[model samples]
Target: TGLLDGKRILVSGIITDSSIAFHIARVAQEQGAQLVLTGFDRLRLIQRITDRLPAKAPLLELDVQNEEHLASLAGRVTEAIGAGNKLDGVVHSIGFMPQTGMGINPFFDAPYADVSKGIHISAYSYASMAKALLPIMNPGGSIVGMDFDPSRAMPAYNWMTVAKSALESVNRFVAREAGKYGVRSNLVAAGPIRTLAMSAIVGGALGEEAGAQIQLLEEGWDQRAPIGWNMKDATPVAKTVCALLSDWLPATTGDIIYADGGAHTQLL
Candidate 1:
């Protein structure tokens, strides 16, 4: 049966077909979920990709850091999904960190200005988004944020590693607050996937040294993960997302479900 049948999910970070957000949206629909996609890139471009989903999702322009956007999010989501309906899940697939903060150099010198933006957008926003959606969330609703396995130091990802760690902590706080309202909040720690974010870091666009180190950072998972890893596919992580959104995980919240092929359990 369709896991997400009759559910409505709001997914962010749909700028490209390669994005995990995009894959999650597609799978959610295949499993009978109605979707609302929040846009960060050009609306026209996002529209093109939205149409590619098995079911086209409506677009909502959202910047989680924007107080105005956060304040009006519940209303926007209600409007997008139609009257008298509430959201069953929200896919928090958004994250951002300026490459300058990365530089892939020694992590020390990134100033507070850079560090704050990195943390605020990628970490703090998780709480803000969930807070905004609380009023409309169904009793068993779920909020799932995407995450990297930030348990240890990642050389080139620099500040993003810090952001992901902050994001994990944020998920717990969100879970505590949302749980009182009967909502579940959690994160999916995924293996390296060659998405737009990873591609930019490892595709030589972030400087050769940065890219090379990151590529190596990504390379090792395939060789070491107990069940192997595929940088090209996002279906596995997407399914984990759907599972969280569904009623099957009724009591699970505030946890990081590592969808990294057991790579997270190993050491270097």
Candidate 2:
């Protein structure tokens, strides 16, 4: 039997076939999840990605920036799935930072408005989602988010990087407040993947100048990464997300799990 058999999930942020959220959604279904996707202004784009799901699922409108959208969340949840089953889990795979505000150079050039954009979408949205879903989320349910480690500075990862730091802090606060209710919040800090947003970030910077190649492999990549790493596969990240969503993480919360093919443990 699937770990999530008969469970219902609400997943957000499916922008492309290569999006991590897309792979997680597909894997969730493969492991017997009944999913309903939530898309924002890019509803049409989500439809194309949704077509790639292992099973056809409902797509609900969810704009994190919209007060009306937040207000309607409960209704949307019920409309997507009747009261028969409480929500088993939620995935917050959403992030946005205009290219102009991304990376180091842009950090100086970035306006407050643009800088705040990252905080609003990448950080605050987690709180917004959890708050909106508070009414219906069942006890022992899970909330997982996608992240990039912000504890260390990176070149060209500017304001967006600041937003990620905030995202991690928010995850902890969410778990602190919501843990008593049996809801857990955690994040998966994944290494670079070739997704639309990631490509955009890399495409704008030294990647264009350096004729980009995976640097970890050139750095004598660790053997602990026995499965090897493939820049094309989103499944590794997807499966880590599934692990957090499943009951195996019953004792884990407010933590950051690395899904970087052991690259995070490397020594120079």
Candidate 3:
């Protein structure tokens, strides 16, 4: 059994094979976690992808922005596992933004609706899930939300950089709120991995012909990083999430651990 043996987890964003939540669920199960999941309107789409789960996991409807769903999320998990079970970990890997917030648009010219989406789904959802799940969490429970460093701007990342900054702020607030309850809150600032969230940016009008460039590794980009880097895998990020979920980091809280293969620390 893995370090998370006998633990129970509720993960969001398992809507597809390429989803970070999918990988997190895969590893969490390997570590012996009992899993429950949540998805939005695409219930049928998630049903098609449910086979990707390690075991036959139960699914619940969770629209992060829906006040009703947020209010009852804790009870839904309990009902799925029956009354006796309680939550030990929570994984939040949800993100959504309109094209106006992500493409080669100036922040000043970006629509407020797009900025609102960037803040709501990408950043606020972390706090939303934490609030909904706190009642079910065991003391020393883990809460992890997938993250990208929002410290700087990227070629086509646009206002997503601003949204990520908001996300990091929410992480600090969550850590503070969870501390008194003995729950540990942290974030894994992962390197870019191919997922539906990124696919939006990749397949949008800002293709290579538009002078937009993906920050894929060239040569010595990893050399500047202390441990070097690779763009091909999300496994290390998953493992780091597992570690934070495990009891190993008992004293760690309010922390933003980089799972970027040391790339975030490098200077160009």
Candidate 4:
């Protein structure tokens, strides 16, 4: 039997076919989960991406920046999941930061408004999304989020790193608060893979520095990641997320599971 057999899951942040969230949704289905996807202002773009999935999933509206959307999320999700069915898992794969605040602008020069928007969408939205679904979440249900290592600085990652750090903190608090309802919260800190977001990180930087920075970053990961890192494969990350949503990790919560080919373990 598949790990997620009969589970109903909600997944967000799938803007393109190569997105980690897209792979997660595909793998979730392959493992026997019923999924409902969420899209925002870019519905047409999101719809095109979803067409590439193994099965067509129902797309619900969820613009995290819109309070009205957030407020009605529960009702929409319930209808999508079908009457009498509570969600068994939720995936918070959404993250955003103004390009200027991330890799383009100097940290000191980034506008506070941009930084605030970054944290709200990338960090605080985890809490907001979780709370919105709690009313319909089944006991022992799990919530998983995407994360990058926020403990240290990386070249060109700037303000988004700060947002991720806050996202991690929010995960812990969600786990603590949601534990009362027998739900769990956790994050998967996956290594870089080729995605639109990665392209943004590399392309946002000025001039020839972009290529050099990307090369240096890749070289560093290749040299240190003991299991060997794959810049093109997002399968491992997807599988890890599915495992977290399954019954196997029943007692685990408020954790950051690394799917970076053991890169987090290296001392160098």
Candidate 5:
């Protein structure tokens, strides 16, 4: 009845209802995919968000920084579904930068410890996930990661930007390797959506100023984008992620589909 009627997918990084990952999880289920969601740190809060989904999904604990979790993911996902079947798709919305490393810190001034941790989680995890997933992912299964534009150095984005840069490269390498197994890997460079995480990276001179800067970017993006961006709605980006998950994109891999309302082209 839907694009994903029998597909099984694993989604991670849903922290809040406003999170892009949350939207992706809802859309994937709505399209008829069976899902298992993963959370880190706060399972209770994540469970509440999961309850709001169109269907019930098991919440698996996964801190991408933890080796045990990654090693056990395939088993846990199989355990969640109760069928012992592998996955058809995996959504990786994982990214993080410690507060001490992002925002106010100049690129040169950021701590290496923080930067490396940020890179490991935000960038390297693509490969980490692919390694853990490929053996279990069915042939033609796909992996999609959430992305912000890291092409330019946006204000206050800090090491997260660099982490995204690394992620873009890591994505291509993953595509290269996963293709041999008939799996696709790609990214959706989504337009700015008003999530709490977005609120934290205000570009103003006054330490993010609680989303006042995000307001400016959204307004400017609306003007520059041919389609006129809506920072509030994440459905467009969610649909894009699901499209890639479907079997239709068999030949598409190692690519980024920008669902940014054409803002990336005219951002200059």
Candidate 6:
């Protein structure tokens, strides 16, 4: 049987086929898991993307910043799963940072208002999502989040780096609090990939400097990554998330599992 056989997972942040969440959902299904997808502000857009999945996952509204939506998350998931079923795991791929607080504005120059928005959306949402799901999440269930390694900073990554640092911290605290119930919390720190989100870095508020820096990183991936790296492939990262969602890692929690093809280990 597949690792996630019969598991039910709630996945968020699938804006396109290239989204890491999309690959996670696809891989989850391949492993015999059922999926529920969350649509925020772009319901139709997300629905359209969902149509391309191997199976039609039930779509539910979940704007992390919306208290009402967060409140209703469990109910909606329950309804989607029908009677006598509870969520087996949750996949949190949500991430956002206001343009003003990203590469566009210097860290010191970025307004607190913008930075707060970044933290709320990118970091705090993990706790919020987990809290909402705790009522229905099965014991031994896992909560997996997507993360860019926060151990270091990148040029033009700016305040988003700070926000990710908070995300990593949040993962630890969530693991501590949820451990009593047998639920696990962890994050997969992935390598650079060409994704809808990464597009923002390549051609968004980060501007030319960010583009050049990423270009250089991409060029060195094959040589620097001991296992080799593919900038366009999210499969390895998605598979790692799947592993975390399975029961095999029952004793592991609050960990940052690196899926960067060994790039993170390179000293130079």
lDDT per residue for candidate 4 within 129-157, as digits (tens), equals 98899889999999999999989987677
Best by lDDT: 4
Among all windows of 10 consecutive residues in model 1, the one with the lowest summed lDDT is: 98-107
Put down candidate 3 lDDT per residue, 148-210, tens digits, no spaces.
Answer: 787866656777778888888998999999987799999889877766545554554465532
Query: Superposing all C-alpha atoms, what RMSD in Å does each candidate have to the true structure?
Result: 1.4, 2.6, 2.1, 1.5, 2.1, 1.6
Cα lDDT tens digits for candidate 1, 1-268? 6888899888988889999999999889999998888997488888888898998778988887789988888998899888789999989998888765675656777877988988888999999888888888889999999999877886777788889999999999999999888999999999988887667766677778888786686678877788889988899999999999999999899999989988888775
Question: What C-alpha lDDT do the candidate models reach, one value each?
Answer: 0.87, 0.82, 0.81, 0.88, 0.87, 0.87
> Which clashing pairs does model 1 show?
none
Which residue runs does candidate 2 get wrong by more than 4 Å? Answer: 197-207, 210-228
By lDDT, the better pick of 4 and 5 is: 4
Which is the better candidate, 1 or 2, if ranked by TM-score? Answer: 1
Extract clashing residue pairs from model 2: 103-156, 103-157, 104-156
The ten-residue window of minimal lDDT in model 5 covers 202-211
lDDT score for candidate 5 against the true structure: 0.87
Single out the weakest 10-residue window by summed lDDT for candidate 6. 99-108
TM-score of each model, paired residue for residue: 0.96, 0.90, 0.92, 0.96, 0.93, 0.95
Q: Write the per-residue lDDT of candidate 6 for residues 1-268, one digit (tens) a residue.
A: 7889899999998888998999999999989999999977889998998998888989898889999999988898999899678888999999888877666456678888988988999999999998898878888899999898878766667888888899999999999877867899999998888886677677744678767777776767667788899989889999999999998888889999999899889865
Ranking by TM-score: 4, 1, 6, 5, 3, 2
Model 4 lDDT, residue 236, Cα: 94
Q: Residue 133's C-alpha lDDT in candidate 4?
A: 90
- For model 5, residues 116-233, the per-residue Cα lDDT tens digits are 9999989999899888888888898999998888988766677888898899999999998898788999999988888876655554433644356557767888898898888889
Reference-based lDDT, residue 203, model 3: 58
